[PDB]
């Protein structure tokens, strides 16, 4: 449950450390982005020699949230923080080559197959 101004951690090796949600994509007046949703982000903090820089405006897929995901039996999987994976603005494909921390099977799509394969754990 991510909105504009939300700060997220980064679940990849793009070089980004802290990103802010500047837009929840996918609809007019669309309020929140959850696990699996694409967001528009600004880089607030980045490592000295990464794939991205502080101030860069791009996209990201949300992979972990404090609100978590519901499963068809009524179950919930929640995370201690909100994390995202940086995506190229046009291709909407990952910038990084490695994924950190667990991800959920909700990413099982043709476009986020790379994220589930790279992830250490899939819940």
């Amino acid at each position: 449950m991510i909105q504009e101004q939300t700060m997220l951690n980064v679940a990849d090796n793009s070089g980004a450390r802290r990103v802010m949600c500047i837009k929840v994509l996918g609809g007019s007046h669309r309020r929140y982005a959850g696990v699996g949703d694409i967001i528009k982000i600004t880089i607030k903090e980045a490592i000295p020699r990464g794939k991205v820089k502080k101030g860069d405006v791009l996209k990201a897929v949300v992979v972990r949230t404090k609100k978590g995901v519901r499963r068809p039996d009524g179950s919930v999987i929640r995370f201690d923080g909100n994390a995202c994976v940086l995506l190229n603005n046009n291709s909407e494909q990952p910038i990084g080559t490695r994924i950190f921390g667990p991800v959920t099977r909700e990413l099982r799509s043709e476009k986020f197959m790379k994220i589930i394969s790279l992830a250490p754990e899939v819940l």
Binding site: R71, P72, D73, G74
Partner: protein
């Protein structure tokens, strides 16, 4: 197709073999007894009037009692009508069970919604509250403007204002029929239906796809 009268028992869930939890409303559908058959010749329209449940003899008035006596049925908690289709035919004193819904895929469920009493514009009409701070004076959940000026010089009919919320006839459409069991007097529908536990429900096959 005709519908039946029931009672909202409450909600539970049905767990499936593929790990799905279906939220269900338990509806008690006891036999519905035909108290009157309305035809074109006598009434100008075709329908069945039904009763269900039981009523204390000391609460059944003489006018009520005579109407049940004519049908040859015991007194029920009330009377409800269902319009007949062409080809649909019933008889006075006939019993209709929940099995009517056996091969009915979706139903429309009517109930009297829970009463919220006198409700403000925020609860009743989802009006947005004004500032909690920033100098607001006595005007947080208050409705704001209710009109324009000298043109039109009046508030319009239908203006969203505070008033009685709930405790009214509400129909929830196209609910999936999960289970029918005449032996247990049961109908399980997927999702929530209007009303409180113990209140009467009208169940009819879905009017839409």
């Amino acid at each position: 197709m005709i519908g039946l009268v029931g009672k909202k028992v409450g909600m539970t869930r049905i767990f499936t073999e593929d790990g799905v939890s279906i939220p269900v409303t338990v509806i008690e559908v006891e036999a519905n007894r035909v108290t009157q058959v309305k035809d074109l010749a006598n009434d100008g329209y075709r329908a069945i009037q039904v009763t269900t449940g039981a009523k204390k003899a000391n609460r059944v008035t003489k006018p009520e009692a005579g109407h049940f006596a004519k049908a040859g049925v015991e007194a029920g908690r009330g009377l409800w009508e269902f319009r007949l289709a062409e080809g649909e035919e019933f008889t006075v004193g006939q019993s209709i069970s929940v099995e009517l819904f056996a091969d009915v895929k979706k139903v429309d469920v009517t109930g009297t919604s829970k009463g919220k009493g006198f409700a403000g514009t925020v609860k009743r009409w989802n009006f947005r509250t004004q500032d909690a701070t920033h100098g607001n004076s006595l005007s947080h959940r208050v409705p704001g403007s209710i009109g324009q000026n000298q043109t039109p010089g009046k508030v319009f009919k239908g203006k969203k204002m505070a008033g009685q919320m709930g405790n009214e006839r509400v129909t929830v459409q196209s609910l999936d029929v999960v289970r029918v069991d005449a032996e247990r007097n049961l109908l399980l529908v997927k999702g929530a239906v209007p009303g409180a536990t113990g209140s009467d429900l009208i169940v009819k096959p879905a009017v839409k796809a």
